[PDB]
Each structure stands twice: as structure tokens, then as C-alpha cells.
Amino acid sequence: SLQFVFACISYAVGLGNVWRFPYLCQMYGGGSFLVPYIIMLIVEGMPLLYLELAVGQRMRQGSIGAWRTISPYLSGVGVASVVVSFFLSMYYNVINAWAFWYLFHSFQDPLPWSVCPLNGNHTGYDEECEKASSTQYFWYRKTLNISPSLQENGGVQWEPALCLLLAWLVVYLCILRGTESTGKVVYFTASLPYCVLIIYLIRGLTLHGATNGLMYMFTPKIEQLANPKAWINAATQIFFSLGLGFGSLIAFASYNEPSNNCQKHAIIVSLINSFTSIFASIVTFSIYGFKATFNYENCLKKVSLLLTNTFDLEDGFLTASNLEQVKGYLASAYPSKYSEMFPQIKNCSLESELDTAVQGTGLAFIVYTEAIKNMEVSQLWSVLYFFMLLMLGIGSMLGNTAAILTPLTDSKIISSHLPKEAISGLVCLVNCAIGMVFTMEAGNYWFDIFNDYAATLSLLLIVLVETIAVCYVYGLRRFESDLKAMTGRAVSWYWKVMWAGVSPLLIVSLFVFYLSDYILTGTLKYQAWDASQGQLVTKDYPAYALAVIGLLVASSTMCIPLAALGTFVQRR
């Protein structure tokens, strides 16, 4: 019935493809990032997803159990499937906290991101809130209080820490309470995001200069299409959104009937996830193009006002459509006065704004706050959108935490020493203590680091190990025979070829290209807020941050080889 479809939609629709995807798409030029994602979907999404589902269905065990039954000296990879997920639990719930914050500032008629604060004379506006948008100032100063550079970090901000604590308490409450009622919850917690996205798409398409963002997002610029970073980010994002590497898919498949269809389920899930991500990108980039058009018009109006004031023209004589002609006429009239203010005139174009209108880890929040502030009843839409986003984040965190706790739940020794219910509380407390780091002044930089690297290489390596083990270690013919015995209609040659020599080769090639690009450039830099310029400036990563990122990647990557060496020693 429709219950299965709703469950598939809920498993496919998560906070990931709604939040992370627009930010990556804007970072990597829009279409130049969108084109690989579709390419990386039909090549890496469906085949690997179906492989994981088939493995989970056939083995009838958990991730650790399945990867131990496949091979002893490989079982440690299952442990890695927990560690990466743990790292996700380190920071992912932090997003929920931000949502909580943006919810709590949604019951006021003077919305905090709607009106800029006064400078102090009650005569103008703050320089930071004037150079940047009100939403951007609210995000970077009144919400994160971010420092200009990562080197200087202040104390733990108390309000973000309290928001994170509340988010963790809600997560723990949902863990304790919700165990099997989700079948009813799927009836409501799966269609609300689509309705909210439809409403916001309508609002965006009703805004002036909205088609520019859609054109930018669908423009496949070949200049930036060759960047390997775009391919790497697309691959890791699709793996994260589909849940590959985390092992939750295997656990879910182990709970289904042996005769349950898997190819159809995997294809439907992958297509729904891709379509939802594309729809969210469409809405977000429509609003983003609206922002870029507004900034371009404001810049043109400022330039025209300055020229009119300094040359005493008519009020309506100078317009956007005839700016450069008037500039040439003024230069030909008296070049001395024109040159007296020539450096003051700014060259602003749609392309530059669309490239640098709004960027960073909080692109979705800023964009949707801007969209909300141009509504009729702003508070209602703000509450609805933030409630939807918080619900998606809560569902994703519940899934991740269940996937983490399942190997711990299966631990007989741990269960015999402590109550099962206290394990969830201990895990939540430890995760909150670790994630309180992101609540500092410079915690946003650490959040960006753990969003860019805590799942980029680890997921790719886990997927590569899993597909190699399935294709060559266990034996492709044996796996196909087992699947045919279980359900019939053996895998088509397309899936066999993709599992054998397409996906691993593409993963290896992408990893090699990324490593070569990093070695050649050697200039891994992060965006940092600049209040004086009111923009984002690229700054080189410090040594300690690079070492921390390397350690975070290395632990997950070496979790499997270390256990393999241990198993080899035990055998010998």
C-alpha cells in the first residue's frame, strides 16, 4: 500500500539532501556541480545501494555480523562503519540546535533578521549590518558570533551550548519513546517537507529576479567543471544522503522478508532522494538568485545616487539601463571631476554577485530567512519551515544513533554490565560534551572542517572496501547464485558490471585526482568572515586544524586495516 511508499520517502528524504546539497551546489558553481551529481548517481548511487541492500537481505545479520561472516580479517570494517557514524553524531545534531535557535527567534513581530540594529546614535545602521545583509549579520554575529580568524577563539558561548543541550535532550527522549510508532509517524513526517518546499517554491517564483538563480544553477560552466573537488564532494554527498557506509541500510535490510524486492526499493529510494535534493536546490537557488538580483540593483542604485549627487543630474535622468553612457558623457565633459571619484565607483555585475552573494555552511538558513522576511505572515512560515527542518534533522539523528547503538546493543558483555537504557544516555552525554566545541566563537570553522572531511574520505574508503569484498572476496557468481535462490530473477549484467569494474575504478580515480590536486595546489584554505569588508575571505588553514582533520580522517580510514592486522596476528 501507500505505507511502503511513505516509509521509502522518509528513508530517502533527510536533513542531508535538504541542507548540505544547496551549500555544496553554490560552492561549486551550480550546474558544474549539478551535472556530476546526476552522473555520480546512476554510476555510484543505485548500484552500490542495491549491493548493500542485497547483502543485508542475504546475510540476515547486522553490519558487523555481516562483514565478519563475509571474512574474518575484514570484520573490522564494520567497526569503522560505527566510528564514522559516531563522528556524524559528533556534529550533525549541532545543525538541529541552530534550527532550535532560529525557531526560538520566530515569535516576534520585529524579526531579528528583518531590521538591522542601530549604530548607537539612533540615526543609521551598523556598518557590519549595512555592508552585509540583515540575515547575514544575524547569522554571523547574533547567532554564531564568529571570530574573523580560526587562530583566535573565545570561550564557549552559553546560548549555543544550551541549544545543543536541548537538541540532545530531545534526541534522547525520541530514542527512549519512539521505537515502533513510526508507522503512524510516517503518515505525517514524510509529506510535510514536500508541502513546505512547494510553498517556498511558489514564493520564490513570485519574487522579482528569480529566474536568474535558476539559470545560474542550471548553467554547466565548463571552466569550473574540470575541478576534481566538485566530483569528490558530489560523491561524498550522494553517499551520505543515501546512507552508504553508515551500515544502517544493511541493518534495515536484515529486518525485511527474504522474498522482499530489493532492486525496485533501491531504485525508488535513489531516484526519490535525487529528485528531492534537486527540488530543494531549485527552491534555494531561486531565493539565492533573488538575493543576488537585489544586491545588484542596490549596488546600481548606490552608484547612480553617488553620480547624481556629485554631478547634479536629474533624479530620474540616470537609470540602470543608461549608466555607462552617462559615465562616458561625464568623462568627456570634465575628466577632472570624474577622476576625483573614479575609484569610488564600484563595478558590480550579476555574475559576481551570483558567485559571492551568500556562501558558507549556513547558506540554507540565510537564504530561507531572507525568503521568510519577504512573506505576508513571516512568523507562520518561519515556524513551519524551521519545524520541518528540525523534524528532518531529528529523524536523521535518530537513524544515525540507532545505527551506532545497534552494535553496542548486540554487545552481550556491555548489556550484562549496564542497563540498556543508560547506554543511550551515556552516548548522548559524551556526544554533547564532544560537540560543545562547535559552540565557541570559532566553532563554526570546526563545524565546517567536520562537515568537509569527517565523511569525505571515510565513506569512499568504506564503500570501496565493501564493494571489493562483495565482488572478489566472496565471489560475484556465488553472490548472484545466492540472490537467485533467495528471490529469483538474478541480477542483470548491468549491476554485475557496475559492482565488478566500474564503481571501484571510479572511486579510485576520483581519490587519485583529489590527492594529486591537493599535492599540486598545497593551498587548502577556508572561508572566513570579514566584518570590515562584510564578506568572506579565503585564509590558509593552520597547522593544528590540518592535523586534527588528518587525524579524524585517519582514525576512520585505519580502523579497518588495524583490525585486519590484529586478526592476521591472531590467526598466526
Next chain:
Amino acid sequence: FVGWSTDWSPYADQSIKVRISLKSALGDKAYEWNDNEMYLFRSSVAYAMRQYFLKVKNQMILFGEEDVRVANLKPRISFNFFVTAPKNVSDIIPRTEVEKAIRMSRSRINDAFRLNDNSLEFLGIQPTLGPPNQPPVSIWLIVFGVVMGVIVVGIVILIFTGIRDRK
């Protein structure tokens, strides 16, 4: 510097410059700035001076449209006006009192021309937007406290039920 300029004068330090943008505040349906609009503006300035001298200094001074002298009119509608004595042109009202008078009755001048504090710039008299009145503290803290209290109560109830089931 050799030469001289035909735009400076010892009394130019008492001049107040006015800049008006009709087609930006009104867009269409905007009147043209002919001599009648200048007469109306001078009458409004004289009225403001009368109001200031009556409501502050308690002096009844009979200003008129001839006592607000205007020069340097430009197609931008940006000129320099200074207010003199009622019949003693050699006497010029100091700029501080003129600025105070304009501040006192700027709303009336804005209303007379259907402009609002941005298309009628006096270049030296900057308006004040107004303090953003604040609730007692805010609403985020109260809602956060209510939500966390409800969450704690629910978690305690769930823990009690689980303990009872395990007992």
C-alpha cells in the same frame, strides 16, 4: 593659489544646502519643481523659523518668503538657502538656530511636499530613526525554558516507566 572663485563668500558659512529628489520618492505622478514650488518651500522654511522663535525664545519675529534667500538652483533641485532678519538683510540668522528650527518642524516640511526624510536632505541635519523598543528580555529564553522543561518532564516519565517495566 592664483585666482579666485565666484562661489565663496563670508556668509556662505551660514548657508544650508537642500537636496530634493522628486522622482525617487514619488516615481510617477510627480510634480515639476517650478517657481511656485520654490515659493511654497520658502514659506515652509519661514513658518518653521517662526515656530522655533515662538516656541523656544519667546520672540515674535515676522519672517516671510522674502527672508529665506535662495541661490545656486540646479536641475537636481539642490540649492543653498539662508534665513536673514525680517527687514535687516545685512543680519543673518546663525546656522545653529536654523538647524534647530529645521529639526523642530521637519515633519511639516516633509508633509508639505509628500517627501519622507530621504528625498528631502538638508545636508547637515541628519534625522533620527527611533529606538527599537525591546520586550522585558526576549522570547527565545522563555520558549527555550518551556521546551526544555517539557522535555525533562517527558524524559523523567519515560525513565520511570522503563524502570517500572524492568522491575
